[PDB]
Amino acid sequence: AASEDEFLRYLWRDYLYPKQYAWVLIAAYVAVFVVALVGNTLVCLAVWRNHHMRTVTNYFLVNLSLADVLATAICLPASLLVDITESWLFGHALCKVIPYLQAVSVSVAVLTLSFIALDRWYAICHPLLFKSTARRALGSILGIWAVSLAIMVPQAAVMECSSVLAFSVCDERWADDLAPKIYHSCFFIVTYLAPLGLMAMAYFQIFRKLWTSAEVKQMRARRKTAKMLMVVVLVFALCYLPISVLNVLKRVFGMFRQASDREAVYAAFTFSHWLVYANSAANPIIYNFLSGKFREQFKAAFSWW
Numbered sequence: 198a199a200s201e202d203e204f205l206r207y208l209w210r211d212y213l214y215p216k217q218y219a220w221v222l223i224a225a226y227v228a229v230f231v232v233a234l235v236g237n238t239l240v241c242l243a244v245w246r247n248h249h250m251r252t253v254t255n256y257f258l259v260n261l262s263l264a265d266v267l268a269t270a271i272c273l274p275a276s277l278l279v280d281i282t283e284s285w286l287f288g289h290a291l292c293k294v295i296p297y298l299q300a301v302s303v304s305v306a307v308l309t310l311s312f313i314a315l316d317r318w319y320a321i322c323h324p325l326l327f328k329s330t331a332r333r334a335l336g337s338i339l340g341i342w343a344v345s346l347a348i349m350v351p352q353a354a355v356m357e358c359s360s361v362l363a364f365s366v367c368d369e370r371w372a373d374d375l376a377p378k379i380y381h382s383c384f385f386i387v388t389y390l391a392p393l394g395l396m397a398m399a400y401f402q403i404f405r406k407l408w409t410s411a412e413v414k415q416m417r418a419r420r421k422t423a424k425m426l427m428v429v430v431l432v433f434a435l436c437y438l439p440i441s442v443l444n445v446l447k448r449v450f451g452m453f454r455q456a457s458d459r460e461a462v463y464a465a466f467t468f469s470h471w472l473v474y475a476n477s478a479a480n481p482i483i484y485n486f487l488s489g490k491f492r493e494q495f496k497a498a499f500s501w502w
């Protein structure tokens with residue numbers, strides 16, 4: 198009578214749920230992969246074609262798309278396999294490269310948003326101290342890459358591919374308990390908390406300032422960009438909060454060592470990994486709704502191809 202209820206429960210646990218879980222996982226990763234690649238390519242195209250769009254902000258936004266593409270093309274497919282098998286199938290060398298490239302992508306992105314807020318802050322709040330030209334934005338972009346490429350070397354250095362006795366795992370090799378705590382504390386503050394906290398205070402001051410016929414035309418244009426950039430910074434802080442918190446709890450507070458909640462821990466990190474990659478898909482979509490100049494070029498792309 199009730200025996201069929203027990204069968205359908207084990208049918209759900211053994212087959213239906215895991216098959217319904219792998220489908221949503223792969224569809225979410227694939228949908229983000231496609232949208233992030235097309236959108237971020239359109240961003241680079243829209244600025245390359247439209248010469249009026251070659252502002253200092255948009256030159257930095259193109260750099261953000263390069264960091265997003267780097268993570269989507271290389272890191273996203275690797276993260277998808279790890280989140281399914283929970284093992285490393287790409288060998289010893291890629292165990293250092295891919296984790297390194299992901300850290301490099303995060304540094305470039307947050308440093309790019311920082312220089313954008315810094316450029317807007319001096320342009321609106323404190324004029325005539327520092328001149329910002331597209332020629333000098335290209336030099337800042339190169340410095341952003343040089344710094345990110347350098348400071349993420351220790352991340353690559355600690356990666357180790359160790360066999361488990363038939364399958365390999367890629368994880369960090371730490372000689373002592375204190376080093377990972379100090380490193381991952383600095384990682385969280387340097388790549389997340391400090392820049393976003395400064396950015397929030399910068400945009401709050403920019404909001405106070407923004408909210409002669411030429412000066413009114415200037416403000417209304419600057420208002421359209423501030424409204425967009427504040428959303429980008431807000432979506433960025435949200436997309437990156439879960440993984441940043443999970444890494445601090447794991448690496449600094451020694452959590453998630455018990456194997457009883459294993460699947461729930463995998464589910465939490467998996468969704469947080471996807472949220473990072475979803476950010477790359479969000480940015481072009483944000484530019485479409487909050488920027489009419491990007492919207493125009495995006496509509497021109499769908500009409501042509």
Ligand SMILES: CCCCCCCC/C=C\CCCCCCCC(=O)O[C@H](COC(=O)CCCCCCCCCCCCCCC)COP(=O)(O)OC[C@H](O)CO
Pocket residue numbers: 311312314315318386387388390391392393394395396398399401402405
């Ligand atoms: C690693 C990479 C770093 C380098 C990357 C560079 C990134 C650069 C980005 C943006 C430029 C920001 C420019 C600076 C903007 C600063 C804006 C600012 O002063 O904020 C005020 C609030 O602060 C205050 O009370 C103080 C608030 C303190 C909050 C502390 C907790 C959050 C931490 C947040 C991060 C700390 C970082 C530390 C930097 C060394 C509000 O203004 P308001 O008009 O009301 O006048 C003040 C009023 O009189 C206070 O009532």
Ligand SMILES: Cc1ccc(-c2ncccn2)c(C(=O)N2C[C@H](COc3ccc(F)cn3)CC[C@H]2C)c1
Pocket residue numbers: 272273275276277279295296297299300303352437440441444469470473
């Ligand atoms: C899957 C993924 C996605 C995003 C992040 C991330 N974390 C913090 C801020 C932003 N994003 C992480 C991550 O947890 N980290 C980044 C890095 C490893 O990245 C990868 C990426 C793909 C792969 F197959 C193996 N490792 C070094 C360790 C650690 C800090 C992992």
Ligand SMILES: CCCCCCCCS[C@@H]1O[C@H](CO)[C@@H](O)[C@H](O)[C@H]1O
Pocket residue numbers: 209210211214460
């Ligand atoms: C918003 C749409 C509805 C979401 C519903 C999610 C149901 C998940 S049931 C799932 O059953 C497994 C059986 O093996 C257990 O292991 C898991 O702990 C448990 O989470």
Ligand SMILES: CCCCCCCCS[C@@H]1O[C@H](CO)[C@@H](O)[C@H](O)[C@H]1O
Pocket residue numbers: 210211212214215216218219222280281460
């Ligand atoms: C992304 C690829 C799919 C991942 C699915 C993970 C969820 C497993 S649910 C369930 O967990 C039980 C634990 O008690 C086992 O007994 C069952 O055999 C298993 O079905």
Ligand SMILES: CCCCCCCCS[C@@H]1O[C@H](CO)[C@@H](O)[C@H](O)[C@H]1O
Pocket residue numbers: 378379382383449450451
């Ligand atoms: C650069 C800053 C470095 C900060 C990290 C080093 C200090 C350890 S924090 C400490 O970690 C323990 C791990 O077991 C937890 O049990 C505690 O609750 C928590 O307070």
Ligand SMILES: [Cl-]
Pocket residue numbers: 279283284285365366367368
């Ligand atoms: Cl792994």
